[PDB]
Design an enzyme around this catalytic site. Structure first.
Site, PDB file in Angstrom:
ATOM      1  N   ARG D  37     113.878  12.246 -48.010  1.00  0.00           N
ATOM      2  CA  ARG D  37     112.524  12.380 -48.543  1.00  0.00           C
ATOM      3  C   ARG D  37     112.218  13.828 -48.511  1.00  0.00           C
ATOM      4  O   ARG D  37     113.077  14.607 -48.115  1.00  0.00           O
ATOM      5  CB  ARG D  37     111.457  11.525 -47.864  1.00  0.00           C
ATOM      6  CG  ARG D  37     110.981  10.369 -48.782  1.00  0.00           C
ATOM      7  CD  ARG D  37     109.479  10.236 -48.914  1.00  0.00           C
ATOM      8  NE  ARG D  37     108.822  11.444 -49.423  1.00  0.00           N
ATOM      9  CZ  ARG D  37     107.542  11.748 -49.168  1.00  0.00           C
ATOM     10  NH1 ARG D  37     106.800  10.931 -48.421  1.00  0.00           N
ATOM     11  NH2 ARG D  37     106.990  12.863 -49.644  1.00  0.00           N
ATOM     12  N   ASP D  70     107.303   9.727 -40.909  1.00  0.00           N
ATOM     13  CA  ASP D  70     107.636  11.086 -41.282  1.00  0.00           C
ATOM     14  C   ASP D  70     108.416  11.905 -40.277  1.00  0.00           C
ATOM     15  O   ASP D  70     109.140  12.825 -40.678  1.00  0.00           O
ATOM     16  CB  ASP D  70     106.366  11.865 -41.649  1.00  0.00           C
ATOM     17  CG  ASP D  70     105.645  11.297 -42.866  1.00  0.00           C
ATOM     18  OD1 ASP D  70     106.332  10.815 -43.799  1.00  0.00           O
ATOM     19  OD2 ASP D  70     104.381  11.333 -42.886  1.00  0.00           O
ATOM     20  N   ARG D  71     108.187  11.662 -38.981  1.00  0.00           N
ATOM     21  CA  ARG D  71     108.845  12.459 -37.943  1.00  0.00           C
ATOM     22  C   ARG D  71     109.649  11.707 -36.871  1.00  0.00           C
ATOM     23  O   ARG D  71     109.164  10.737 -36.300  1.00  0.00           O
ATOM     24  CB  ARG D  71     107.820  13.337 -37.231  1.00  0.00           C
ATOM     25  CG  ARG D  71     107.091  14.399 -38.076  1.00  0.00           C
ATOM     26  CD  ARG D  71     105.832  14.981 -37.348  1.00  0.00           C
ATOM     27  NE  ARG D  71     104.551  14.429 -37.829  1.00  0.00           N
ATOM     28  CZ  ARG D  71     104.003  13.271 -37.447  1.00  0.00           C
ATOM     29  NH1 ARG D  71     104.582  12.497 -36.554  1.00  0.00           N
ATOM     30  NH2 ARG D  71     102.890  12.845 -38.020  1.00  0.00           N
ATOM     31  N   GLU D 195      97.740  23.312 -47.339  1.00  0.00           N
ATOM     32  CA  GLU D 195      98.939  22.629 -46.869  1.00  0.00           C
ATOM     33  C   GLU D 195      99.973  22.757 -48.001  1.00  0.00           C
ATOM     34  O   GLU D 195      99.662  23.317 -49.068  1.00  0.00           O
ATOM     35  CB  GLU D 195      98.663  21.180 -46.533  1.00  0.00           C
ATOM     36  CG  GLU D 195      97.990  20.979 -45.195  1.00  0.00           C
ATOM     37  CD  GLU D 195      98.111  19.541 -44.721  1.00  0.00           C
ATOM     38  OE1 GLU D 195      98.237  18.652 -45.587  1.00  0.00           O
ATOM     39  OE2 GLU D 195      98.109  19.275 -43.495  1.00  0.00           O
ATOM     40  N   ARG D 211      98.025  22.531 -51.239  1.00  0.00           N
ATOM     41  CA  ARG D 211      97.459  21.184 -51.107  1.00  0.00           C
ATOM     42  C   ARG D 211      96.233  21.017 -50.192  1.00  0.00           C
ATOM     43  O   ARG D 211      96.378  20.824 -48.980  1.00  0.00           O
ATOM     44  CB  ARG D 211      98.555  20.210 -50.652  1.00  0.00           C
ATOM     45  CG  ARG D 211      98.086  18.818 -50.269  1.00  0.00           C
ATOM     46  CD  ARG D 211      99.173  18.103 -49.499  1.00  0.00           C
ATOM     47  NE  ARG D 211      98.709  16.830 -48.954  1.00  0.00           N
ATOM     48  CZ  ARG D 211      99.493  15.791 -48.653  1.00  0.00           C
ATOM     49  NH1 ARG D 211     100.804  15.843 -48.835  1.00  0.00           N
ATOM     50  NH2 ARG D 211      98.970  14.694 -48.126  1.00  0.00           N
ATOM     51  N   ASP D 212      95.032  21.047 -50.761  1.00  0.00           N
ATOM     52  CA  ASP D 212      93.845  20.830 -49.952  1.00  0.00           C
ATOM     53  C   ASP D 212      93.822  19.321 -49.654  1.00  0.00           C
ATOM     54  O   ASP D 212      93.569  18.480 -50.551  1.00  0.00           O
ATOM     55  CB  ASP D 212      92.609  21.266 -50.719  1.00  0.00           C
ATOM     56  CG  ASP D 212      91.323  21.117 -49.916  1.00  0.00           C
ATOM     57  OD1 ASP D 212      91.265  20.278 -48.982  1.00  0.00           O
ATOM     58  OD2 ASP D 212      90.359  21.843 -50.234  1.00  0.00           O
ATOM     59  N   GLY D 216      89.222  18.794 -51.217  1.00  0.00           N
ATOM     60  CA  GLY D 216      89.272  18.853 -52.673  1.00  0.00           C
ATOM     61  C   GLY D 216      90.453  18.352 -53.475  1.00  0.00           C
ATOM     62  O   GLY D 216      91.590  18.258 -52.994  1.00  0.00           O
ATOM     63  N   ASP D 243      95.513  16.674 -58.388  1.00  0.00           N
ATOM     64  CA  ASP D 243      96.032  16.361 -57.069  1.00  0.00           C
ATOM     65  C   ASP D 243      96.016  14.831 -57.179  1.00  0.00           C
ATOM     66  O   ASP D 243      95.988  14.320 -58.273  1.00  0.00           O
ATOM     67  CB  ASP D 243      95.056  16.857 -55.995  1.00  0.00           C
ATOM     68  CG  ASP D 243      95.697  16.981 -54.591  1.00  0.00           C
ATOM     69  OD1 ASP D 243      96.500  16.095 -54.183  1.00  0.00           O
ATOM     70  OD2 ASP D 243      95.350  17.973 -53.893  1.00  0.00           O
ATOM     71  N   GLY D 264      88.315  14.684 -52.589  1.00  0.00           N
ATOM     72  CA  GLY D 264      89.074  15.711 -51.887  1.00  0.00           C
ATOM     73  C   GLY D 264      90.165  15.340 -50.896  1.00  0.00           C
ATOM     74  O   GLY D 264      91.342  15.749 -51.051  1.00  0.00           O
ATOM     75  N   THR D 265      89.789  14.543 -49.895  1.00  0.00           N
ATOM     76  CA  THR D 265      90.703  14.118 -48.841  1.00  0.00           C
ATOM     77  C   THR D 265      92.018  13.562 -49.370  1.00  0.00           C
ATOM     78  O   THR D 265      92.101  13.128 -50.522  1.00  0.00           O
ATOM     79  CB  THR D 265      90.011  13.156 -47.866  1.00  0.00           C
ATOM     80  OG1 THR D 265      88.801  13.779 -47.389  1.00  0.00           O
ATOM     81  CG2 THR D 265      90.905  12.868 -46.664  1.00  0.00           C
ATOM     82  N   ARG D 290     100.814   7.970 -57.021  1.00  0.00           N
ATOM     83  CA  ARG D 290     101.828   8.953 -57.424  1.00  0.00           C
ATOM     84  C   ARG D 290     102.793   8.204 -58.357  1.00  0.00           C
ATOM     85  O   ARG D 290     103.885   7.819 -57.934  1.00  0.00           O
ATOM     86  CB  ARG D 290     102.604   9.439 -56.204  1.00  0.00           C
ATOM     87  CG  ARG D 290     101.859  10.352 -55.289  1.00  0.00           C
ATOM     88  CD  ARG D 290     102.487  10.319 -53.914  1.00  0.00           C
ATOM     89  NE  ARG D 290     102.014  11.412 -53.065  1.00  0.00           N
ATOM     90  CZ  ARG D 290     102.330  11.565 -51.779  1.00  0.00           C
ATOM     91  NH1 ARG D 290     103.129  10.686 -51.165  1.00  0.00           N
ATOM     92  NH2 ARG D 290     101.814  12.580 -51.093  1.00  0.00           N
TER      93      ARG D 290
HETATM   94  C1  LIG Z   1     105.431  16.779 -40.888  1.00  0.00           C
HETATM   95  C2  LIG Z   1     105.110  15.648 -41.847  1.00  0.00           C
HETATM   96  O1  LIG Z   1     105.030  14.495 -41.413  1.00  0.00           O
HETATM   97  N1  LIG Z   1     104.943  15.928 -43.133  1.00  0.00           N
HETATM   98  C3  LIG Z   1     104.644  14.950 -44.055  1.00  0.00           C
HETATM   99  C4  LIG Z   1     105.649  14.298 -44.738  1.00  0.00           C
HETATM  100  C5  LIG Z   1     105.331  13.369 -45.714  1.00  0.00           C
HETATM  101  C6  LIG Z   1     103.998  13.064 -45.987  1.00  0.00           C
HETATM  102  C7  LIG Z   1     103.658  12.213 -47.019  1.00  0.00           C
HETATM  103  O2  LIG Z   1     102.762  12.570 -47.819  1.00  0.00           O
HETATM  104  O3  LIG Z   1     104.235  11.113 -47.080  1.00  0.00           O
HETATM  105  C8  LIG Z   1     103.011  13.710 -45.281  1.00  0.00           C
HETATM  106  C9  LIG Z   1     103.321  14.634 -44.316  1.00  0.00           C
HETATM  107  N2  LIG Z   1     102.320  15.336 -43.722  1.00  0.00           N
HETATM  108  C10 LIG Z   1     102.076  16.544 -44.210  1.00  0.00           C
HETATM  109  O4  LIG Z   1     102.890  17.163 -44.907  1.00  0.00           O
HETATM  110  C11 LIG Z   1     100.773  17.167 -43.898  1.00  0.00           C
HETATM  111  N3  LIG Z   1     100.557  18.174 -44.953  1.00  0.00           N
HETATM  112 CA   LIG Z   2      93.127  16.184 -51.620  1.00  0.00          CA
END
Ligand SMILES: CC(=O)Nc1ccc(C(=O)O)cc1NC(=O)C[NH3+]
Ligand SMILES: [Ca+2]
Ligand SMILES: *[C@@H]1O[C@H](CO[C@H]2O[C@@H](C)[C@@H](O)[C@@H](O)[C@@H]2O)[C@@H](O[C@@H]2O[C@H](CO)[C@@H](O[C@@H]3O[C@H](CO)[C@@H](O)[C@H](O)[C@@H]3O)[C@H](O)[C@H]2NC(C)=O)[C@H](O)[C@H]1NC(C)=O
Ligand SMILES: *[C@@H]1O[C@H](CO[C@H]2O[C@@H](C)[C@@H](O)[C@@H](O)[C@@H]2O)[C@@H](O[C@@H]2O[C@H](CO)[C@@H](O[C@@H]3O[C@H](CO)[C@@H](O)[C@H](O)[C@@H]3O)[C@H](O)[C@H]2NC(C)=O)[C@H](O)[C@H]1NC(C)=O
Ligand SMILES: *[C@@H]1O[C@H](CO[C@H]2O[C@@H](C)[C@@H](O)[C@@H](O)[C@@H]2O)[C@@H](O[C@@H]2O[C@H](CO)[C@@H](O[C@@H]3O[C@H](CO)[C@@H](O)[C@H](O)[C@@H]3O)[C@H](O)[C@H]2NC(C)=O)[C@H](O)[C@H]1NC(C)=O
Ligand SMILES: *[C@@H]1O[C@H](CO[C@H]2O[C@@H](C)[C@@H](O)[C@@H](O)[C@@H]2O)[C@@H](O[C@@H]2O[C@H](CO)[C@@H](O[C@@H]3O[C@H](CO)[C@@H](O)[C@H](O)[C@@H]3O)[C@H](O)[C@H]2NC(C)=O)[C@H](O)[C@H]1NC(C)=O
Ligand SMILES: *[C@@H]1O[C@H](CO)[C@@H](O[C@@H]2O[C@H](CO)[C@@H](O)[C@H](O)[C@H]2NC(C)=O)[C@H](O)[C@H]1NC(C)=O
Ligand SMILES: *[C@@H]1O[C@H](CO)[C@@H](O[C@@H]2O[C@H](CO)[C@@H](O)[C@H](O)[C@H]2NC(C)=O)[C@H](O)[C@H]1NC(C)=O
Ligand SMILES: *[C@@H]1O[C@H](CO)[C@@H](O[C@@H]2O[C@H](CO)[C@@H](O)[C@H](O)[C@H]2NC(C)=O)[C@H](O)[C@H]1NC(C)=O
Ligand SMILES: *[C@@H]1O[C@H](CO)[C@@H](O[C@@H]2O[C@H](CO)[C@@H](O)[C@H](O)[C@H]2NC(C)=O)[C@H](O)[C@H]1NC(C)=O
Ligand SMILES: *[C@@H]1O[C@H](CO)[C@@H](O[C@@H]2O[C@H](CO)[C@@H](O)[C@H](O)[C@H]2NC(C)=O)[C@H](O)[C@H]1NC(C)=O
Ligand SMILES: *[C@@H]1O[C@H](CO)[C@@H](O[C@@H]2O[C@H](CO)[C@@H](O)[C@H](O)[C@H]2NC(C)=O)[C@H](O)[C@H]1NC(C)=O
Ligand SMILES: *[C@@H]1O[C@H](CO)[C@@H](O[C@@H]2O[C@H](CO)[C@@H](O)[C@H](O)[C@H]2NC(C)=O)[C@H](O)[C@H]1NC(C)=O
Ligand SMILES: *[C@@H]1O[C@H](CO)[C@@H](O[C@@H]2O[C@H](CO)[C@@H](O)[C@H](O)[C@H]2NC(C)=O)[C@H](O)[C@H]1NC(C)=O
Ligand SMILES: CC(=O)Nc1ccc(C(=O)O)cc1NC(=O)C[NH3+]
Ligand SMILES: CC(=O)Nc1ccc(C(=O)O)cc1NC(=O)C[NH3+]
Ligand SMILES: CC(=O)Nc1ccc(C(=O)O)cc1NC(=O)C[NH3+]
Ligand SMILES: [Ca+2]
Ligand SMILES: [Ca+2]
Ligand SMILES: [Ca+2]
Lengths: 388, 388, 388, 388
Positions: D37, D70-71, D195, D211-212, D216, D243, D264-265, D290
């Site tokens: 990913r 994600d982590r 971001e 990326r806000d 926004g 966005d 925004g969020t 998306r």
């Molecule tokens: C470190 C981490 O988990 N990154 C992401 C990966 C994917 C992800 C996603 O949109 O699936 C979101 C994540 N968080 C961010 O990037 C915050 N800007």
């Molecule tokens: Ca946004």
């Protein structure tokens, strides 16, 4: 690194010696190997690489189902060295359903074609980056050489056609140097339908034995002049003349001028080359299907209309076996430039029914001046063994 | 890049140290690995590569069934670096059932043989392109060295035989430089049947310990003169002398001149080398089968007829295990050129019955001047574990 | 290419930053990956490569059964780049059950050991060819560093031991330059049992923090002088001192002179390094087993006997997890030479019972001068997921 | 090897031509391919390489279960050449869940991030060795660009943020040359939440469309001055602005100054670039999810607040299909530097339910000055075919 130009006399050959084979289908029954078709090979100044159009999937995949279809977005230009098959670590050089590749001396060139049949884009990549692109010019399945293009003195040349397969079409010969198109010229001369050109360098120009898919069993010639951008058509005098479907050897004609109107429609990519008034040429063994393959020199096959006198024949694939597409590729010797050729052996669906996929394997020989023997080097895949 | 010539004294060895192994069969039980046989290795000026004749298929394939057969069109020259096994991404250097490869200094050379038993073609490839070819000269299974050829001063030499295996045959020694054949010379001297020569460079010529497959258990010698194209036969004086089948050690004879007529017929590719009047030599442990392997120096084994006095023995493969073919390969040191050797360990059909395939694995040692110990490094494939 | 010599001040580190991991076990559950153990890494002037001793088989093979055994003939030195796991196309550098590798600047060096426990051979390979070899000198399992050796000014040095593991043994330090042994020297100083030395370059000599497998929980030091062939023993002052089994942190002793006689017997390969009077050091979290891993600097841990005062700790593997062997490897910076370390995380049989194999994975960090955070980077293989 | 600096005019593009695709998911149904990913690509002076964050496992593994997270510690920076998918022999460049990579001309740079969300370490690797590292500065999931960083004249620049995703955070732009951090600067200008910056070189500075994720739907701009370490924020004037979630095209606003406070969020990584007062830009087809992707130039999209006038649109992925992340990557031409872009197409869990894994595939196009056609190049993986 200097530029290629090919100013060496063509090697006086005596037939074709065995050169390579990659057993793609056999190995596909025990291993992750790609599904392809429309193969070809092209030697860079140092070594020969083998290309093909893979269908975004492996053979023992469930995605292999229905690969008889020629075009899909998930289609790309696979490229490995000659000998090593298309395994899971093969790079995908670009997105494409129609292609061509050459090497100007300095680096490569890949004209990759994707998009819709009505509107498509041919991307021109050179030295790894994308340099130019061209749109469809007639809205009907823009296609190209399907084998190696040829670059003399820094300038590469690939012929291209867009229009209808079995009806007339719009063909032109683009001169694209450094990935950048620096000229386009339309067809000239006596040819009626030029598709899938096998083009070899013949100083100081380029020659193409193509595929008339509408009006003839005889094969169209295309002559490009690199110093003028001038084009010229003809046809192969060979009374023996071979496309597929073909009429019959004792009932086949050609006048070197226009379509013979003998089963003309449909065909297959093929090849041939001159030697004075003589013409070395490959052909499938059968007039009706693409089964088996044979090569031979036709006496007076290049300068005498309708000559059907052959000397020096070789069976490459036995008549009880499959073949398909094929093209010629040349390589420089330390004295003369030889001419070799590849032969695609297709298995699977449409013809074969046990399985639902379509893929090919390859064999390849090269011109020799020495003596040779006999054989039939085909696929070798028991359809009952193969998955699906 | 200068040309090889080997003008360095052979290294005074004291036995063989462990050098490499590739576990092909074990890994074949869990992974896509090729089916081969007739292996060999040859070091280019920089690194050692391992060759073999793969049967156009992988082991856990259904195509592996019946690989005991020596010849098929779908057979090719696999080539990887020493140590890395023949996996799905190994290149297939050429089409072949009989082979040989060397490196003149500048580039490689592969004499690949395919075609029918009655009429075959030996293609000569050098620097990647195909340069020449030769036809069968007696219509009976044209074969070659089956190991590395040797090139002194720009000229490579491979001995070749065509005729009957167990009956006399037609053997000649071709001198093929730059892929181009620049001479051929027939056999001379006292030898009766020369097959599968293990040839090493011995300035300023080449020497070959071969395989008399018709009249003797003793091994034929072949001497080539690179500066004259003159040939010479002999036999190995070693009373200990070893081929397979072999007679018995206390009942074996050799006069260095002609076949001993002791079980003569049939055999196996082998090797040996001189050191003054001494002869270092490998042999299977058994007279009857190809099981286990042993090396040793025979005192006066090179200059005294029928000497059966041995010093310095090493078990390479235990007597309760399989072996097969084997050849010697030499490599240049920074002072002297050492001599190493490989040993093919075949498993599968004919001997072993649970499975229906035939494939080998390898081990390889190298001459040392230092001290050593003891062991038995064999295959290691539980036949009950293996597929089929 | 000039020779390595390392005349740069060691980098003043502040802890260890994350550097690499290869997930070998996870990927082994879905893919043809080798069974190994006893890993290590060593950077050539350009890039870091990762080594290990593979057991002539893959994990999801039936041959994986019973890989807890340390020695078999079918054992070899696998070698890939750092990051890429040991897949089916990894080369097998040599036959071996005990090993070490370094790079003098010009090329590599691999001391590979095979043969019987009673009589074994250590083959010395350099630049690809085999240059020398040595026999066992006490008939009891001849072994070596099990990590990277160090070459200063053209001369490589690997310490070696042969004798009994839990009883005294015969250890010597061979100085082997260009693959050729040019000296041997026995142990000197106060150490009782030297096994598995982690050796780093410290101009103008070499230092080794080893493994007393007979009398102590404290770790033996070995000092080699490249300009004299003189040896020296000591022990690590660290009261904190860590091997496994270990006694307890408040009940552990060391005088920098002789074995502490606290659970002494048995152990594990480990590492440590000086910084003035301070000692950076790794250790498993537990005194009893090899579970989890922790690093920290011990104040006065190099010059004050029995100092048990620690600053700067990092958990590398959580206490609820497995570890095992580990060694240090150093790499030259453009100003100072840093010191990194690897950690083998073993899974499978003996400890874990669901499965019948034994294999490891790795993690690796590197010294940093910058700031850092927190974590626990372990294996990650659900034993219920894994085959067997 | 000289250093990169990019002092060439940006190429006047006319749309995007097809450039590459790697079919990762299709091939994953028949072959050992990694689960990833967050992909991206970055061209070194010679060739383009493709990156991604693999989850320490392959797709048809049992470890693939629950890869929506994600982590994890078992996460690393996979890296192959563009075109070749992430198979079992792909190297793992470093341990990481957040990343960025660039090439200063001389060598690479990889800012890899692992550790806990509360305290993490960002390791800086250059030329293969580890040179520096940085600790978390706010204890809340330290992250970075997620695409290629840009190095002008020996100095690389990667923007970095640590703090809360949907709430304000702490962002700074570190200037890290030779792997060593030689400056840090915090955010300046009108942006509220930066971001995942897509940053391209624009002599003599760097620009980032980010990326806000808090206030926004409009995208924040970030301007870095390599000669001063001065930062500047703005927003994209495009009324069309995109966005996801997004509001609506006829109901969307932007003043180039501050968040539009329209949904925004949350969001997704994206990209865009200037051309005078015009702005070329990618966007998903949908405001809510998306799915699908579209590109187009917005007239006055860079200099006129709220301009919603578009010319030159292209569908890259059909609306009935998936997309996700995406970033821009630029490459130098022999006259001007072009700008290309990649698009991650994610499949699997959360959205798709049949399966329990999460992985992506990619497509990639490049700016062209030539003509083009039409299409929709998506994944192509029948979820019913795929394992799990
Ligand atoms: C470190 C981490 O988990 N990154 C992401 C990966 C994917 C992800 C996603 O949109 O699936 C979101 C994540 N968080 C961010 O990037 C915050 N800007
Ligand atoms: Ca946004
Ligand atoms: C390969 O595909 C064929 C048809 O080609 C497409 O199929 C799609 C869904 C996909 O695979 C794509 O790759 C191809 O473009 C499949 O053929 C149909 O299979 C069923 C199997 O049962 C046949 O019998 C009838 O089918 C229903 C379910 O569809 C069942 O309840 C009964 O058995 C019923 O009798 C159907 O008539 C087949 N259709 C055609 C046009 O042949 C095929 O199954 C698939 N095969 C393999 C081995 O992969
Ligand atoms: C491996 O092959 C053997 C024979 O070798 C060739 O077979 C061809 C068709 C192909 O595999 C090619 O690779 C080889 O050159 C197979 O042996 C025969 O198998 C049948 C299995 O049933 C035996 O029993 C009898 O066979 C019929 C069907 O043929 C069945 O109705 C009954 O079981 C009947 O009793 C037959 O006698 C075998 N013949 C020989 C010469 O041994 C073999 O099955 C195949 N095996 C494997 C494991 O791959
Ligand atoms: C892994 O191996 C063990 C023992 O280790 C060796 O086994 C050899 C033959 C080979 O695998 C080699 O790699 C190892 O060095 C196997 O354990 C034995 O398995 C049987 C299974 O049935 C146990 O039960 C009894 O066995 C007989 C047949 O042997 C059966 O009739 C009955 O079930 C009977 O109850 C036996 O007690 C096991 N022995 C030991 C020492 O544990 C094991 O099966 C194998 N396993 C796997 C998953 O690969
Ligand atoms: C994939 O995982 C899910 C849940 O995710 C985690 O599961 C762990 C243990 C591991 O896989 C890790 O990768 C994931 O983070 C599994 O879902 C549960 O499966 C059972 C299957 O039976 C469901 O039914 C009930 O389960 C018990 C045993 O747990 C059985 O006796 C009965 O069938 C009972 O009805 C359970 O409710 C599922 N839980 C959730 C949250 O969905 C899933 O099975 C696994 N699947 C695959 C295809 O790999
Ligand atoms: C075709 O290319 C070669 C490559 O330079 C040109 O001829 C060689 O070039 C120089 C001097 O001309 C030397 O490399 C040899 O004398 C030439 N041949 C070879 C095989 O080396 C040649 O001039 C070019 N052709 C034309 C028509 O200009
Ligand atoms: C390939 O290159 C040669 C090398 O220059 C071309 O030959 C030259 O032609 C120009 C004028 O057309 C002269 O200035 C040179 O002196 C000629 N030859 C040489 C060897 O110098 C040749 O035309 C080119 N080939 C093609 C097909 O365009
Ligand atoms: C065999 O090859 C070498 C390679 O050139 C020749 O000897 C070397 O060549 C030069 C001068 O002769 C230098 O490289 C060294 O003095 C020689 N040996 C080595 C190992 O470098 C040698 O002349 C050739 N053999 C013959 C018989 O001519
Ligand atoms: C290998 O090469 C050497 C190098 O030239 C050969 O030795 C030379 O022999 C010729 C006449 O035969 C002389 O002109 C040279 O002066 C000799 N040696 C050297 C080092 O110059 C040698 O014959 C060649 N080897 C073989 C087997 O043909
Ligand atoms: C260690 O190796 C280096 C490599 O040559 C030697 O020092 C370098 O060598 C020259 C001149 O001495 C230049 O490369 C630099 O001034 C030196 N260092 C570096 C990092 O480049 C050095 O002399 C050798 N050590 C000893 C003790 O002789
Ligand atoms: C590594 O090499 C240097 C480079 O020569 C050694 O230092 C030299 O020592 C000799 C006498 O021992 C002198 O002739 C040189 O002038 C000294 N240094 C230099 C830079 O020239 C050094 O001893 C070597 N290191 C080791 C551990 O042996
Ligand atoms: C950007 O890099 C190039 C690489 O050197 C510099 O310009 C080139 O450098 C020399 C002389 O300046 C030659 O390579 C060409 O004239 C220049 N361009 C190219 C494409 O080759 C350039 O000076 C650097 N940029 C700046 C702003 O200093
Ligand atoms: C990239 O490099 C050039 C090359 O030196 C920089 O331009 C030079 O600026 C200095 C003073 O700032 C002058 O001494 C040079 O004479 C200028 N240019 C050249 C071509 O020599 C330029 O500033 C650098 N770019 C960035 C963004 O820092
Ligand atoms: C674009 C495309 O579909 N090419 C073909 C592939 C195979 C193919 C064939 O013969 O199976 C025919 C194709 N059509 C043409 O080449 C028209 N000359
Ligand atoms: C061409 C071919 O079949 N070669 C053999 C391979 C193996 C083989 C064998 O011993 O299994 C025998 C062969 N025949 C010979 O080499 C005759 N000397
Ligand atoms: C040769 C060999 O068996 N080495 C070992 C491997 C692992 C191993 C172990 O700890 O699992 C122990 C071994 N023995 C030693 O190293 C003695 N210091
Ligand atoms: Ca036709
Ligand atoms: Ca015999
Ligand atoms: Ca101990």
């Amino acid at each position: 690194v200097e530029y290629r130009n090919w100013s060496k006399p063509q090697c006086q050959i005596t037939g074709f010696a065995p050169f390579s084979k990659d057993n793609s289908i056999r190995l596909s029954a025990g291993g992750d190997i790609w599904v392809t078709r429309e193969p070809y090979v092209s030697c860079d100044p140092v070594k020969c690489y083998q290309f093909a159009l893979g269908q975004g999937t492996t053979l023992d995949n469930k995605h292999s189902n229905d690969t008889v279809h020629d075009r899909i977005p998930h289609r790309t230009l696979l490229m490995n060295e000659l000998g090593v098959p298309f395994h899971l670590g093969t790079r995908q050089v670009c997105i494409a359903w129609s292609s061509s590749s050459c090497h100007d001396g300095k680096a490569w060139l890949h004209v990759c074609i994707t998009g819709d049949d009505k509107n498509a884009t041919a991307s021109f990549i050179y030295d790894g980056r994308l340099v130019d692109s061209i749109g469809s010019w007639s809205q009907n399945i823009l296609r190209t050489q399907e084998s190696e293009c040829v670059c003399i003195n820094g300038t590469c040349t690939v012929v291209m056609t867009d229009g209808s397969a079995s009806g007339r079409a719009d063909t032109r010969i683009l001169f694209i140097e450094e990935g950048k198109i620096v000229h386009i010229s339309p067809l000239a001369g006596s040819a009626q339908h030029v598709e899938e050109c096998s083009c070899y360098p013949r100083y100081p120009g380029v020659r193409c034995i193509c595929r008339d898919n509408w009006k003839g069993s005889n094969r169209p010639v295309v002559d490009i002049n690199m110093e003028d951008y001038s084009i010229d058509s003809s046809y192969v005098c060979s009374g023996l003349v071979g496309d597929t479907p073909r009429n019959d050897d004792r009932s086949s004609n050609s006048n070197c001028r226009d379509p013979n109107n003998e089963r003309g429609t449909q065909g297959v990519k093929g090849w041939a080359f001159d030697n004075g008034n003589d013409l070395w040429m490959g052909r499938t063994i059968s007039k009706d299907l693409r089964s088996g393959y044979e090569t031979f020199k036709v006496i007076g096959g290049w300068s005498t209309p309708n000559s059907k006198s052959q000397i020096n024949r070789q069976v490459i694939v036995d008549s009880d076996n499959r073949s398909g597409y094929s093209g010629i590729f040349s390589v420089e010797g330390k004295s003369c430039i030889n001419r070799c050729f590849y032969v695609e052996l297709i298995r699977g669906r449409k013809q074969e029914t046990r399985v639902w996929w379509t893929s090919n394997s390859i064999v390849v020989f090269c011109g020799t001046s020495g003596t040779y023997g006999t054989g039939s080097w085909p696929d070798g895949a028991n359809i009952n063994f193969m998955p699906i």
